[PDB]
Design a protein around this ligand. Structure first.
Ligand SMILES: *[C@@H]1O[C@H](CO)[C@@H](O[C@@H]2O[C@H](CO)[C@@H](O)[C@H](O)[C@H]2NC(C)=O)[C@H](O)[C@H]1NC(C)=O
Ligand SMILES: *[C@@H]1O[C@H](CO)[C@@H](O[C@@H]2O[C@H](CO)[C@@H](O)[C@H](O)[C@H]2NC(C)=O)[C@H](O)[C@H]1NC(C)=O
Ligand SMILES: O=c1ccn([C@@H]2O[C@H](COP(=O)(O)OP(=O)(O)O)[C@@H](O)[C@H]2O)c(=O)[nH]1
Ligand SMILES: O=c1ccn([C@@H]2O[C@H](COP(=O)(O)OP(=O)(O)O)[C@@H](O)[C@H]2O)c(=O)[nH]1
Ligand SMILES: *[C@@H]1O[C@H](CO)[C@@H](O)[C@H](O)[C@H]1NC(C)=O
Ligand SMILES: *[C@@H]1O[C@H](CO)[C@@H](O)[C@H](O)[C@H]1NC(C)=O
Ligand SMILES: O=C(O)CCC(=O)C(=O)O
Ligand SMILES: O=C(O)CCC(=O)C(=O)O
Ligand SMILES: [Fe+2]
Ligand SMILES: [Fe+2]
Ligand SMILES: [Fe+2]
Ligand SMILES: [Fe+2]
Ligand SMILES: [Mn+2]
Ligand SMILES: [Mn+2]
Lengths: 700, 700
């Protein structure tokens, strides 16, 4: 039973990169003893991601092994550190080594790298990996010393060719009892084996299983082009995220805060921008510590920015606008904003936020800064859909791909802080990282590749992790896909594409409370109910849209009213059809009036059909009143669109059979009365100003 | 200026017939002096209506004239009396005689009667009547004496041939200055001149005008076959009926009363007979003075008569039934009933009343008896139509014809007591007239002619007037034309043909009062109105008709109710369509429910459309309740058809949104509530007995 106190892990690492630190945490979880060679030095092993190299690893190890040249009592395992995580204990590792009968076991690989023509020389293996991989091997210290002694080559020569050449010596391979871990009992190299590796869960720990060989490896090596697959596994293995404990490295549970450069990007016509700009004033972070940069690409949004700009300038420490007349492409804009932060040593954190990100959590900035990562994004999704501001995986093209755990994360079945290949629309970046690790200006620009992808790739190429937190509800993403800008108030037409935001801007703030009892709804006259439905902004924009159409009814015009004997009872009005708002208004009816009606009239059901939908204008100079009549409806909805007193005098609705009068309508509130038989009614004369109302004859 | 004290009217009359008395009244109106020859004697002048005759007139006149043979100071006018009325004064008559230059003026006639071959011998006249008529002549007494002296012939020879022969003597005609009144200045004979005579009205007097000659005759002679035309004129001329005075011989203003034989005739299936038989008990005339005879030709009416017969037998002095098993034809039945009166000297008046006569005036018998005529009928019309129980005129066929004043009489623009050619369905006849003047048994029978016509003709042939009074509202005539007897209660289906009577039997007696305010209508729940609509008899017959169909609803049956989510809400019921009563029930709705609805819901109009009309049966053993639902109607009508307590326990209607319960329905009363949106409602469980209701979903 070999003693774990005699096992030493040796690894190489010239800097404490996020991968190195991920490795160490996995080593410390199992209580391994880790010696790290090279930590302050310059890497001379060549660009291992483009070419061969790594001989410097062998030189440093050879020098370290001279201490242990005679230590037959010591087992040593050498592993890479930037792309390796440990998944099993020293005890299990040692038992498995001993079972191999080997004196120095190398990991095995599907590819014969870097000289593919050496494959013939290798021994035959039935089903396991055939070839040697230098990223991981374990053996007696005396045997390892005898191998690494023979290093006498350049720092930029290939370490794995060196070991392969020695392994392919039949006399040497037998003298020293050298072996390869063909069936991945100990070492799992991913390159060429992705289809064989799955996560194996436990209550408080995760590891990996090779389903081809039915093994539980100890060492997971994301060798070659599998770093992102290793990134994926390292979110779980060994104690990343677990069924019972959750995430293991996040906070879980949440005097001057760091100065922040906040950069906002308006790169396409985007709905509800006035609302977004107003949210900036509400972000819970001291505004004297925030510098605002706003890039607007859209002349459509210039009035919006202008209205908001005085309040922003008074709010934040400093503000800078870059408008459309500057002709910047989105890539150049984002380079410029990031570089303003990079070049200012007082910029401790850089926070990029696009205009289609709705931050519902006003503490997002604090939360992300406290997470203490180089780069981190809050998870934002489109309402009720899977689409989000991150990708879990990449295609070989390096385009979008759905990771095996994407849906669980978007649905927040698994919450934590995830290492992912792509983030967008909102993220926070350390100022130090921009200065020390990505000093180039051309981060988003440079190739014909999309800027958002180029940015992520820029960070991946430096080995910087991209973190994504779904630990909290942070907000959502607006649909901007087909946003029709040819209206006086385009956001009035957003009831389909952005219904959550549409409701919050146009439905009365006390509507939902009214629909749940609470004694808001009123019944001023028998079977006439009165409730808040439309927000003041909705009334104002709707009136303005009607006046902008300008073509009100006149003589010869006919409505669906019933008075006396086949009389015609018209109003000066505009029907929703004429302005192109029928479909939107029916959606309102379906969603907000239908349910209100069934609640106030128990027993009644409706799908809210209405062929007659129109806005009425009363004035002393044209048609000031509406004579007694019935409506061609099962029930009628009558919504006040302006203020009695401020905008008009007189007016109001009278119900003759009940000698009951609605003398003082409320802007945004609706009347709901039966349309036939019982509620013969009259619109009293408007005596001054202009009185606007919205009328729907539903279920005719 | 000849003195009217020297003018004597001589006429012949063997009896004081109604025509003679009509003549005398017209003579007394103008203050003529009338000598009447022959009053107690036997007429030997032959049948003047079949043949020639009348010589007896000349014999009596010749004897009377011997007194005046030398009285050159006297003017004498001889006229017939049974078919003559005077229309002008003695003064006007005398002036006109004098203007003629004649010493003995005869009336003229279009026909050369009785020897047509004497026409050549007459003098030529341009346009006036050419030939002599003996019914009227005026002249100096000495001249008349010289003419009548020459009478030496049989009582049955023709008087007019005698005068013609003397007139056609050229020497005589010139010696005595004999003349004919060619242009009807004085005498108007109607035969051959009907087209020339019209009535000329004045405030308090009527006369006739000859429009061919533009004259105003003094003497109107209905000679030959024009007696009925004279009958017509004599209703006005000279003071019969006048614009300002009205009728001149009627009462205008209305201790043992005469014994009466009342005879009732049921000669065809007739509607509402139970009601008619019940009316007999209400006739305002002492029942101990009335003998009832009832002839029923219809087995359909045997149960009706049987139900009523105990009350009739207890009511009247004596009663006799003659049923269908006696095989009597209507003619034999009416002969038999009239002859029972004829042969009983205690039968002072005979009153014949058919079963389709509705006497609304319970004093009809008194009124007609007080009118003191031989034969008189009260005017009865079919509701809102011109058809009545009399004819004003006869065709040459002696069939129906419309008199020039028929419509004015039916519409009661002219009221009085009229001499008319035909009466039917109700009339009163003096017992004496039957004994003394129509002793034959075969009054209605004898020829293949209709009995009703034969009866009138029988009386006309004896010169008996047929009187018709429209001086009062007496009643109406039922339509019996197409009476469908193939029902359990045929009168339920009479809403079209006899709507006045249908209303009085089936509509609630307090319906009309309720429709005119008076605080009968109730509103037991908000916008649920409650009013009396159906009579108890209507409910009882309607239920019984449904149970007699017997085929009530069951499983798989679907109604037009709306509950929850596309649930099916059935009732065990029968729809009006199935029993063949839809059209009738819609008529009820149109006529009685429509107007009630518009009165209780001011502003609403309806033509009372209803596709769903049905009777519901609730029982503990089948379907006792009706779960909460809405109706496919603008408003719903809900009529109770039996008695809570007597016939069922439990039941009632509940309106959930109003926490209001109709716990105690009223048989025959209707509920009226809106059908949609507001009045979600439930039929409570019937716990004992059977609860029937009538339901209509109107305006769906
Ligand atoms: C929604 O409901 C709230 C609470 O019922 C309303 O609040 C009040 O507003 C009045 C006048 O604006 C104030 O005098 C009260 O002090 C407020 N009460 C509270 C608890 O805030 C609010 O006005 C309603 N909103 C709308 C648009 O009608
Ligand atoms: C129609 O209305 C009359 C009067 O309102 C009702 O008459 C009364 O009936 C009750 C019970 O039958 C008696 O106690 C009263 O004395 C009656 N009053 C009078 C003035 O007659 C009559 O019942 C109503 N008819 C129906 C069928 O409901
Ligand atoms: O600048 C560098 C590059 C690499 N390494 C170490 O050398 C190993 C070899 O690099 P890599 O794992 O990327 O090569 P591959 O396994 O993909 O062939 C890394 O894991 C680190 O342990 C290092 O210390 N500094
Ligand atoms: O039974 C009779 C029939 C006739 N007359 C008288 O004789 C007249 C002649 O009869 P009528 O007028 O019917 O004959 P016509 O004028 O039609 O030829 C009558 O008007 C009566 O004045 C009479 O007294 N008794
Ligand atoms: C690691 O060592 C500590 C004692 O030094 C011990 O308490 C802990 O449980 C060990 N953990 C594992 C996973 O072996
Ligand atoms: C008839 O005579 C009386 C007097 O005897 C007279 O009062 C009356 O007015 C006269 N009527 C007519 C119509 O001549
Ligand atoms: O002006 C009002 O409030 C009543 C008008 C009405 O109900 C209608 O549009 O038909
Ligand atoms: O039984 C009742 O009174 C209620 C039933 C009803 O209204 C219906 O027939 O639809
Ligand atoms: Fe309109
Ligand atoms: Fe209306
Ligand atoms: Fe039914
Ligand atoms: Fe119902
Ligand atoms: Mn590696
Ligand atoms: Mn005559």
């Amino acid at each position: 039973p070999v003693n774990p106190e005699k096992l030493l892990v040796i690894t190489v690492a010239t800097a404490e990169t996020e991968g190195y630190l991920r490795f160490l945490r996995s080593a410390e979880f199992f209580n391994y003893t880790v010696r790290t060679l090279g930590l302050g030095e310059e890497w001379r092993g060549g660009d291992k991601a483009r070419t061969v190299g790594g001989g410097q690893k062998v030189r440093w190890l050879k020098k370290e092994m001279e201490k242990y040249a005679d230590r037959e009592d010591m087992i040593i395992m050498f592993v890479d550190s930037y792309d390796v995580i440990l998944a099993g204990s020293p005890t299990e590792l040692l038992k498995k080594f001993v079972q191999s009968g080997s004196r120095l076991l190398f990991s095995a690989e599907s590819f014969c790298w870097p000289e593919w023509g050496l494959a013939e020389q290798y021994p035959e293996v039935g089903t396991g990996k055939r070839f040697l991989n230098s990223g991981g091997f374990i053996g007696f210290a005396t045997t390892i010393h005898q191998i690494v002694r023979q290093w006498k080559y350049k720092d930029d020569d290939d370490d794995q060719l060196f070991y392969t050449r020695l392994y392919l010596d039949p006399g040497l391979r037998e003298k020293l009892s050298l072996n390869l871990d063909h069936k991945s009992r100990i070492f799992q190299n991913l390159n060429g084996a992705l289809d064989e590796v799955v996560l194996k869960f436990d209550r408080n720990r995760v590891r990996i299983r090779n389903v081809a060989y039915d093994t539980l490896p100890i060492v997971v090596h994301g060798n070659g082009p599998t770093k992102l697959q290793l990134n994926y596994l390292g979110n779980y293995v060994p104690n990343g995220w677990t069924p019972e404990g959750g995430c293991g490295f996040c906070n879980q549970d949440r005097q001057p805060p760091p100065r922040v450069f906040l950069a906002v990007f308006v790169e396409q016509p985007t709905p509800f921008l006035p609302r977004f700009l107003q949210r900036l004033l509400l972000l819970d972070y001291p505004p004297d510590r925030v510098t605002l940069f706003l890039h607007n690409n859209e002349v459509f949004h210039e009035p919006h920015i202008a209205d908001s700009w005085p309040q922003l300038q008074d709010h934040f420490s400093a503000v800078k606008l870059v408008g459309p007349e500057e002709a910047l492409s989105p890539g150049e804009a984002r380079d410029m904003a990031m570089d303003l932060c990079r070049q200012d040593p007082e910029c401790e954190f850089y926070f990029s936020l696009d205009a289609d990100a709705v931050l519902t959590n006003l503490q997002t900035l604090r939360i992300l800064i406290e997470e203490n990562r180089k780069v981190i994004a809050p998870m934002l999704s489109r309402h009720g859909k899977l689409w989000s501001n991150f990708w879990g995986a990449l295609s070989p093209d390096e385009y979008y791909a759905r990771s095996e755990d994407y849906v669980e994360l978007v649905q927040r079945k698994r919450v934590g802080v995830w290492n992912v290949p792509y983030i967008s629309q909102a993220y926070v970046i350390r100022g130090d990282t921009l200065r020390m690790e990505l000093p180039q200006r051309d981060v988003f620009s440079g190739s014909d590749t999309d800027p958002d992808m180029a940015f992520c790739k820029s960070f991946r190429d430096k080995g910087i992790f991209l973190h994504l937190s779904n630990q909290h509800e942070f907000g959502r993403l607006l649909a901007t896909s087909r946003y029709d800008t040819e209206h006086l108030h385009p956001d009035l037409w957003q009831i389909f594409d952005n219904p959550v935001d549409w409701k919050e801007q146009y439905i009365h703030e006390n509507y939902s409370r009214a629909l749940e009892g609470e004694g808001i709804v009123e019944q001023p006259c028998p079977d006439v109910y009165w409730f808040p439905l439309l927000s003041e902004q909705m009334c104002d924009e709707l009136v303005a849209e009607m006046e902008h159409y300008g073509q009100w009814s006149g003589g010869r015009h006919e409505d669906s009213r019933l008075a006396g004997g086949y009389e015609n009872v018209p109003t000066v009005d505009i029907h929703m059809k004429q302005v192109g708002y029928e479909d939107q208004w029916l959606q309102l009816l379906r969603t907000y009036v239908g349910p209100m009606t069934e609640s106030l009239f128990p027993g009644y059901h409706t799908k809210a059909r209405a062929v007659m939908n129109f806005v009425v204008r009363y004035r002393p100079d044209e048609q000031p009143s509406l004579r007694p009549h019935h409506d061609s409806s099962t029930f009628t909805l009558n919504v006040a669109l302006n203020h009695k007193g401020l905008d008009y005098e007189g007016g109001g609705c009278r119900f003759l059979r009940y000698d009951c009068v609605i003398s003082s309508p409320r802007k945004g509130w609706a009347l709901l009365h039966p349309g036939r038989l019982t509620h013969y009614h009259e619109g009293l004369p408007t005596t001054w100003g202009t009185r606007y109302i919205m009328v729907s004859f539903v279920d005719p």
